[PDB]
Amino acid sequence: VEVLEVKTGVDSITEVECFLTPEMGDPDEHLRGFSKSISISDTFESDSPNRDMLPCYSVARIPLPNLNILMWEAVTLKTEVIGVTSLMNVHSNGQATHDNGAGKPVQGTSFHFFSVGGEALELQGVLFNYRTKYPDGTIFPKNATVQSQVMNTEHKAYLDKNKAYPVECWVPDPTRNENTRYFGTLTGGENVPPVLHITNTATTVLLDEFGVGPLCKGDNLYLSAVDVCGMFTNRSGSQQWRGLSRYFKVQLRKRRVK
Amino acid sequence: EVLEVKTGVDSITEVECFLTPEMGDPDEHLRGFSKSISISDTFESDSPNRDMLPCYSVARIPLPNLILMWEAVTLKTEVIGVTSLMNVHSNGQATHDNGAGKPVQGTSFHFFSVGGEALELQGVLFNYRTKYPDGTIFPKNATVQSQVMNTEHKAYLDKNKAYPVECWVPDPTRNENTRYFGTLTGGENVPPVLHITNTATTVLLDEFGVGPLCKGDNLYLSAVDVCGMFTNRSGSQQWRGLSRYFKVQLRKRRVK
Amino acid sequence: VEVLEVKTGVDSITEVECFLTPEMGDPDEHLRGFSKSISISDTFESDSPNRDMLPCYSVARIPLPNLILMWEAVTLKTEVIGVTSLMNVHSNGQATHDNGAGKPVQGTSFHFFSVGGEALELQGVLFNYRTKYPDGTIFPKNATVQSQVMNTEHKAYLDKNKAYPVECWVPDPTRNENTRYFGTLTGGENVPPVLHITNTATTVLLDEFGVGPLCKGDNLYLSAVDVCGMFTNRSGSQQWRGLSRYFKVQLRKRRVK
Amino acid sequence: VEVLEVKTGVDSITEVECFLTPEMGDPDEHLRGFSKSISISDTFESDSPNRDMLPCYSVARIPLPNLNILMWEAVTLKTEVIGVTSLMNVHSNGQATHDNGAGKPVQGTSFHFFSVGGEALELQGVLFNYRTKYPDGTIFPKNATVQSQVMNTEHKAYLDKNKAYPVECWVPDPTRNENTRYFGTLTGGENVPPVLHITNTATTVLLDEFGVGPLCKGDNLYLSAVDVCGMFTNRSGSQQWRGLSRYFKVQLRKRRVK
Amino acid sequence: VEVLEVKTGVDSITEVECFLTPEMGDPDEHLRGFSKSISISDTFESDSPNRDMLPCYSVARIPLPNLNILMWEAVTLKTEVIGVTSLMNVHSNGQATHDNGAGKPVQGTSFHFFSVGGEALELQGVLFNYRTKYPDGTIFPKNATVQSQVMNTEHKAYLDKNKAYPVECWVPDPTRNENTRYFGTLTGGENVPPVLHITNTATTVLLDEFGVGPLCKGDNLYLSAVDVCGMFTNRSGSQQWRGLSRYFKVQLRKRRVK
Numbered sequence A, D, E: 001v002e003v004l005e006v007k008t009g010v011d012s013i014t015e016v017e018c019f020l021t022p023e024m025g026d027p028d029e030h031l032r033g034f035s036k037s038i039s040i041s042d043t044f045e046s047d048s049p050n051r052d053m054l055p056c057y058s059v060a061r062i063p064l065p066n067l068n069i070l071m072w073e074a075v076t077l078k079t080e081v082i083g084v085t086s087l088m089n090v091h092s093n094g095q096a097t098h099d100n101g102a103g104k105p106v107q108g109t110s111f112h113f114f115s116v117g118g119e120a121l122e123l124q125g126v127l128f129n130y131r132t133k134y135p136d137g138t139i140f141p142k143n144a145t146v147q148s149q150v151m152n153t154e155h156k157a158y159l160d161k162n163k164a165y166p167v168e169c170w171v172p173d174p175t176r177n178e179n180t181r182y183f184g185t186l187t188g189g190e191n192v193p194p195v196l197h198i199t200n201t202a203t204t205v206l207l208d209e210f211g212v213g214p215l216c217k218g219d220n221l222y223l224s225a226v227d228v229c230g231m232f233t234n235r236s237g238s239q240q241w242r243g244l245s246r247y248f249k250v251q252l253r254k255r256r257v258k
Numbered sequence B: 001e002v003l004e005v006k007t008g009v010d011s012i013t014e015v016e017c018f019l020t021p022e023m024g025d026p027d028e029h030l031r032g033f034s035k036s037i038s039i040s041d042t043f044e045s046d047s048p049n050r051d052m053l054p055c056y057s058v059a060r061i062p063l064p065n066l067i068l069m070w071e072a073v074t075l076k077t078e079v080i081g082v083t084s085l086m087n088v089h090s091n092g093q094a095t096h097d098n099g100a101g102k103p104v105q106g107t108s109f110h111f112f113s114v115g116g117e118a119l120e121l122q123g124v125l126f127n128y129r130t131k132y133p134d135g136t137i138f139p140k141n142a143t144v145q146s147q148v149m150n151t152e153h154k155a156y157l158d159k160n161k162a163y164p165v166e167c168w169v170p171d172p173t174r175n176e177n178t179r180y181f182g183t184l185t186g187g188e189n190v191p192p193v194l195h196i197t198n199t200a201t202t203v204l205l206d207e208f209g210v211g212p213l214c215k216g217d218n219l220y221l222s223a224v225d226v227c228g229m230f231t232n233r234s235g236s237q238q239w240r241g242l243s244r245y246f247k248v249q250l251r252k253r254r255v256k
Numbered sequence C: 001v002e003v004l005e006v007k008t009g010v011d012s013i014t015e016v017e018c019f020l021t022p023e024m025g026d027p028d029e030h031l032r033g034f035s036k037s038i039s040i041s042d043t044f045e046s047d048s049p050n051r052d053m054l055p056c057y058s059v060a061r062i063p064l065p066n067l068i069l070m071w072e073a074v075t076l077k078t079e080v081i082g083v084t085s086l087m088n089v090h091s092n093g094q095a096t097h098d099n100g101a102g103k104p105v106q107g108t109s110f111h112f113f114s115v116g117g118e119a120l121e122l123q124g125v126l127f128n129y130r131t132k133y134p135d136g137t138i139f140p141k142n143a144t145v146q147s148q149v150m151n152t153e154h155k156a157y158l159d160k161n162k163a164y165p166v167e168c169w170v171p172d173p174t175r176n177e178n179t180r181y182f183g184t185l186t187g188g189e190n191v192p193p194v195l196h197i198t199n200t201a202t203t204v205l206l207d208e209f210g211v212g213p214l215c216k217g218d219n220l221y222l223s224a225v226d227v228c229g230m231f232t233n234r235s236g237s238q239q240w241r242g243l244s245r246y247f248k249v250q251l252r253k254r255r256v257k
């Protein structure tokens, strides 16, 4: 792909705007945005998480206006987590911080992640415990060995399906993703406070050091996200992951390629 | 069609004010506080009383009567009364035997916006089965999808003491004519960190050099400043809020 | 006043250097820099703190060389003096755990300073409007429930030492055009003090038009609060601990009409 | 070396891309990336850690295209920790946060370190306790004295072997390392949260204040890392170090020297 | 003195490189870098710390090449705490974090300080408790009064001797020190985590707003430091300060003065 000039004229720019909903596991008809309560295996080899207990990566493939060689080039992103204030509900059968106190808020381990590319996000598998038995309906690292706990280059995938790729098994592959820009933060620890900023005044530029943004193959834009905000603690002490949706607004321009 | 800025004597004005918090005000002595928080016995029976729910604050400020429109260019803002949180002697729960009272701390939301029309809101519910109380304006026809995103839940922040903080956020798909800024810091032991200074200015211009344009010569200011919770001797906890200062500089802009 | 040109020449600059001591309550002859130990009221309505339990704003009015020309404050260097004293964890403190060192000063802090050409202007805000503030302090009068969020009756000048309780008053953002102020409240009973010292950091006091505070009557006003946190005694009782603040201000002569 | 001009043209640049795996101790065939459970000596004089309980520095010597005077000059680095999301496995034989709660995540003391150089990283030994008996198979400060607890200039070494130099005994020698760029952060304390950021948009420039990067002696590039993320607590309360792999991508150019 | 031009030519620059060891109290022949265990007086009045329980400021006076009017002007500083990874020894007579856990790492109150000057650092005394009895062998504020607890201007000194000036009763005097640059941070609290960064890529410029660095009177450079990293808790629960050495590299140039 030899990248040539940007087209100008009213015809030459478009914008994509949407929200990606979280895929936390949704253990029943009332619990969209939550996982199943977390249970702990008695040994590493008996770790066998249920599908509804595992947060997964969210992905949307967004069709763009048909171009054909011109390709749509992603230039800027505005993004934010939607519903941050819902975490102020400390009255809905939570565990009291102390006698007569309010409910404990969502807190603990979080992962906030987003990416914009001209093709599916490329993944590398890394396992906390290579003996974990991942459940039917998920897509997970296969032929796992003990080396999979640090780096096994067999574990390559594309984030090409929703509700499928568990967050804990997969990360962006830094050896690939030439045509994607990704950003993520893991903040670990059972008592970590969510710190969630919102504003409509912040923009991320998606251009690389050569002035080129992701180029959308087949006129498809790929957006991916994870927003595990922490865990909700019920009155009983049981804990569930809670996630939130992520807003994306991407500005694209037409670029000629050879 | 946004054209040139007017210059000269007549061409600039300034709005200054304070927005008071709306934390619930459970009796005649408790302005700035919510009712003590109670916890539902089950998830599906969540039913908070009105005076236990902090709400968004809003003020519509009339501007000098003027096509010209007032354009909001700069903002200075801060929380007013930060030091009041040093009152650790007013029947609080002692940190330990013979200790001082626990200060206000825990989950906070600090938010402000400036716009030329009402802030546009999107509803998101922690629990879609929460029964919100009479006197509040809340997401209607809630479904389980309301827990992550239900696009039916659209509203305007057009009334005080009405829109609960926990149900609503700025709608990022709208608000083209508003600039908003907010931070949620969650967790029961989070410390308030509150900065004051008269030397900091936020510029409200967009990337094209245009600020919010004030329709009908009105400026919209919105805020939430839930600072955390106060813990009483008994262990019961109430939200505590503070007022927010706004100073906005505006200039006359021609529009076609 | 029209602000005209800065005067130049050897004669045209001056410098003020001083320290402001903290006013934490000083409950006896050995406890300068500390408050009285904190007591908690039995009911919310009966809150009635003693004067020696209430830290106050510090202020100094500094006379400048006699001079229309006015002295214009241009820069500030400032820092908290005696930060290392907080390493004394061996003086009648409460042990962190069995056999452990004493708990250091920690918890709620307020660090504040201002430089102006007239007294700092204050606005009152009350945690609890039914608090009975003690004789010898200057506090918001005619308090109502609105005073818990905003009652514009409560206006004052920081014009006296050992008088204006920190917990009652903040800088009035609707005034103070001729002062620059800066403060941080860090609340919570376990927050760690984080105190930086250096002689290499300068704050510029000029506004967006390039004009600094202009000293009316050739007086410079400096104000400070440095409540570093609470010291916990062996018994568990807790006292506020404050420290002094250094100020160095550079000033220049400015013509006005 | 007198440093002269940079060569230009198609042939004048090369890139190195790889991952360094962590060397945390690997106490059995299922625990790659973990140390042995930590045990505590009764006294300073009886401190005698086993080899599998001691994380070590990772190092790779990467041969570069043969040049001969020209040398490869390292100019930029992209790096990130691989597998950050694996730390969201809070269901695999971990100690519950509280009754009925999720497993505690990896947390506590961490050391994140990386270096890029034109020769081996130079190390200086500093011991917490000079009377520690370091185990067979490790390379550790020899002839330790009480002065070794603060600075004993005898303890000089090169990071020239994997699985050998314990992290707790050695630091980069600030008095040397003119031909290396190193960066590290120790965050100590039993409850500190991991905060791990990932993105493919961040580059570190390796040039010094004269515009000169590490110069690769004998056409070898040396990459070194430690990423001790914290400790994993199992259900019994025992704690093990957990580490992760680090990705490196280094761009190099040819430089003439005299 | 009037500061005139900088000298140029290869003769005109010099460099000082050294390390300053910590002086934490060194309670016996095996505990270099540690204080004595910390004990607590029953009253303010009875506060009487042992010499070996009191960390002190470190100082080195470094002779420079003889000049004579020319003076050496200090222009840049690179500095680093040496041995940060030693704090990963959590297996040496430490108190377990919980049953079967690892040892508690060094944590709690820290003071990290350094200065570079052309004369001795000027100190001002401030006492936590003016009735504290400072021990024989230390140099402390004399004629203390209750005003010494906030500011007593009688308490002036020069940092002109090692193992002498206790950290807790002296600070840099901001009313003096025109010919020194100093930097320090106190982080207080019993559980605060050490956060220690190391790199050889960071330089501090020592020039003031007029482009003039410290001028070395009598061809002597003064380096001062404190690096109290926190406290080590042994198995009994007793606590000792732990310090580390600090590296300095200072670049100087010849300046003419009148």
Ligand SMILES: CC(=O)N[C@H]1[C@H]([C@H](O)[C@H](O)CO)O[C@@](O)(C(=O)O)C[C@@H]1O
Pocket: A027, A031, A034, A035, A036, A037, A093, A234, A235, A236, A237, A238, A240, B042, B043
């Ligand atoms: C948000 C919610 O629904 N919480 C409820 C949970 C979850 O439904 C399940 O744990 C999901 O797996 O179930 C409980 O029996 C429990 O574990 O204490 C009651 C609790 O009120």
Ligand SMILES: CC(=O)N[C@H]1[C@H]([C@H](O)[C@H](O)CO)O[C@@](O)(C(=O)O)C[C@@H]1O
Pocket: B026, B030, B033, B034, B035, B036, B091, B232, B233, B234, B235, B236, B238, C043, C044
């Ligand atoms: C600030 C305040 O008023 N605190 C009081 C509260 C609140 O009035 C209610 O909780 C409001 O809902 O009532 C108490 O009975 C309580 O809960 O312990 C006594 C306490 O002193």
Ligand SMILES: CC(=O)N[C@H]1[C@H]([C@H](O)[C@H](O)CO)O[C@@](O)(C(=O)O)C[C@@H]1O
Pocket: C027, C031, C035, C036, C037, C092, C233, C234, C235, C236, C237, C239, E043, E044
């Ligand atoms: C630093 C100090 O002086 N501590 C003493 C305090 C204070 O003098 C008062 O609390 C001031 O109000 O008084 C005690 O009775 C206490 O409260 O435990 C004894 C303690 O030794």
Ligand SMILES: [K+]
Pocket: A174, A175, A176, D017
């Ligand atoms: K690649």
Ligand SMILES: [K+]
Pocket: A017, B172, B173, B174
């Ligand atoms: K839009």
Ligand SMILES: [K+]
Pocket: D174, D175, D176, E017
């Ligand atoms: K060197």
